[PDB]
Design a protein around this nucleic acid. Structure first.
Lengths: 273, 312
DNA sequence: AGGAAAGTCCCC
DNA sequence: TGGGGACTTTCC
């Protein structure tokens, strides 16, 4: 009898909501999803079918998987964890009512107090470890299922974690996303000024990654050039080939150094010198 | 007779109100003075004077009539959003240096309000004229902690409510009052109060100093409809407009208005617009106008950037 | 659901 | 005595 996630929660892109925003307003969707054919996180209990409980909870995104201070909310959610009876006539079941409620950094102690008052910790991490400051910007769902043993008594299946989910609000944990864009032709030599209308970025950790497999180059600009987390004004990179003859058409995309995420690329038209 | 005159009004545009949670000594209400190598600060001066006299400063509203504003003045000699500087010698001019505007939380307006009107109906020098003028009376005499009429406190309190809904926390006004020697001792008499220009909190998105930070093309053909990337500073998508303009001889100005949509106003600091047709598309020699961000509501504009309408 | 406002932090 | 940018929460 073993749990397995046949559809992970759509990692980057959802913005955890504070409890103070009109309550609800959505749910966690799965890696693969789109409005035409929507999705929500799912697990396929394997090697068993029937009655039991399908408990979930949020856990630290790294090594000591400590109960994380945010709270899941939705149908059958309480004290921070979703807990309900799973439908017995199927082995693949999804949760379309999973919300991630975040806590204001100040009530951050009251929560981790609740994450052991309420008796919550899949991995049984020591209080010592629970003290270390949290990364209230990323969570992992922890599906820990209870099926029935050959006899009939409750059986605690192994807790399995889902790919981390990252807030969208946190300007450093978001999904890089170019928007409009001054231009893209430039030339083999490079030194050209483009205006980029990025989504909320950060002047310390971000940088246009001109590239094209067989090459790769950042755009020349500076923190001063990053206009309100929103606009970046760089100069077209010298191409690797600084004596082109015909139009190589590489690809530029905002890259975030720290985490290394990159964005859906665009089409820069590196022209003949 | 004697009377307060404003030797120097407050800067008005450019001073960011600071929340009680930001730190003291964060800045100081500047007077209306940039004047290169030289600071400034608001200052008033009595007239047909009174040798020694004390002047107190406090924050009033900005609407039709002068009411008591929640934000409080905070600085050296200030306490309880009031500042008793004394102009009591052979020199009447009295400046208010290093003053500040505590920004009250919406969450706490009624409270500071009620707590201000009240610590004023018991003054007379702060006549019911500002709280509920239904309170009309008082003078100056005294009454520290003196109880107010039970029914009184109400007309005060309820006033401390129907006014809070109307209180704009993004704009204030200084209300200098002079008091002078009376009946041997006490700076007993309220010598006519003077109220300053409006001071516009610098942080209100509506009060931002429209600035043109960068621009795609400085020049462009006269034939219009050309895309440009103009990186500004905290504009308000609906209430903004890019405007090209040039004066033709004595008086008479010419104006053009960049095309676009709130849609085109990217994240409050970017507007992507297309140029407009210049004065006349028929020009054998390059023409130069100016482009200036512009707030539609108050028409407050901005230091402009030059453009160059080249021929067709 | 975004986008903004309202309010806090924090650093040169 | 200074001030400004952007982080966090809240509003809609």
């Amino acid at each position: 009898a073993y749990v397995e996630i046949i559809e992970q929660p759509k990692q980057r892109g959802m913005r955890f909501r504070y409890k103070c925003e009109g309550r609800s307003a959505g749910s966690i969707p799965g890696e693969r999803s789109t409005d035409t054919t929507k999705t929500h996180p799912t697990i396929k209990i394997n090697g068993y079918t029937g009655p039991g409980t399908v408990r979930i909870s949020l856990v630290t995104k790294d090594p000591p998987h400590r109960p994380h201070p945010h709270e899941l909310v939705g149908k059958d959610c309480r004290d921070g964890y979703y807990e309900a009876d799973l439908c017995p006539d199927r082995s693949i079941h999804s949760f379309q009512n999973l919300g991630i409620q975040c806590v204001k950094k100040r009530d951050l102690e009251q929560a981790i107090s609740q994450r052991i008052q309420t008796n919550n910790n899949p991995f049984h991490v020591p209080i010592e470890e629970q003290r270390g400051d949290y990364d209230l910007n990323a969570v992992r769902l922890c599906f820990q299922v209870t099926v029935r043993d050959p006899a009939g008594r409750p059986l605690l299946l192994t807790p399995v974690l889902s790919h981390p989910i990252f807030d969208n609000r946190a300007p450093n944990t978001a999904e890089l996303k170019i928007c409009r864009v001054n231009r893209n032709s430039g030339s083999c030599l490079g030194g050209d000024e483009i205006f980029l209308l990025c989504d909320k970025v950060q002047k310390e950790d971000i940088e246009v990654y001109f590239t094209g497999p067989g090459w790769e180059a950042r755009g020349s600009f500076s923190q001063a050039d990053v206009h309100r987390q929103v606009a970046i004004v760089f100069r077209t990179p010298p191409y690797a080939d600084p004596s082109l003859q015909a139009p190589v058409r590489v690809s530029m995309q905002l890259r975030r150094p720290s985490d290394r995420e990159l964005s859906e690329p665009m089409e820069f038209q590196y022209l003949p010198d | 007779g004697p009377y307060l005159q404003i030797l120097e009004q407050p800067k008005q545009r450019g001073f960011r109100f600071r929340y009680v949670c930001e730190g003291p000594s964060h800045g100081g209400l500047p007077g209306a003075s940039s004047e290169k190598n030289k600071k400034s600060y608001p200052q008033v001066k009595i007239c047909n004077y009174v040798g020694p006299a004390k002047v107190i400063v406090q924050l009033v509203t900005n609407g039709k009539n002068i009411h008591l504003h929640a934000h409080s003045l905070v600085g050296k000699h200030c306490e309880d959003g009031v500042c008793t500087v004394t102009a009591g010698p052979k020199d009447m001019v009295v400046g208010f240096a290093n003053l500040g505007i505590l920004h009250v939380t919406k969450k706490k307006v009624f409270e500071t309000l009620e707590a201000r009107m009240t610590e004023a109906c018991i003054r007379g020098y702060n006549p019911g004229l500002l709280v509920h003028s239904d309170l009309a009376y008082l003078q100056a005499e005294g009454g520290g902690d003196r109880q107010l009429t039970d029914r009184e406190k109400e007309i005060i309190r309820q006033a401390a409510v129907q006014q809070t809904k109307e209180m704009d926390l993004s704009v204030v006004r200084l209300m200098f009052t002079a008091f002078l020697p009376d009946s041997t001792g006490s700076f007993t008499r309220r010598l006519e109060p003077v109220v300053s220009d409006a001071i516009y909190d610098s942080k209100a998105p509506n009060a931002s100093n429209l600035k043109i930070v960068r621009m795609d093309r400085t020049a462009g053909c006269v034939t219009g409809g050309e895309e440009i990337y103009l990186l500004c500073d905290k504009v308000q998508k609906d209430d903004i407009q890019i405007r090209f303009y040039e004066e033709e001889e004595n008086g008479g100005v010419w104006e053009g208005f960049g095309d676009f949509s709130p849609t085109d106003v990217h994240r409050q600091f970017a507007i992507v617009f297309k140029t407009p047709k210049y004065k006349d598309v028929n020009i054998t020699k390059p023409a130069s106008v100016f482009v200036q961000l512009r707030r539609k509501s108050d028409l407050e504009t901005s230091e402009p950037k030059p453009f160059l309408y080249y021929p067709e």
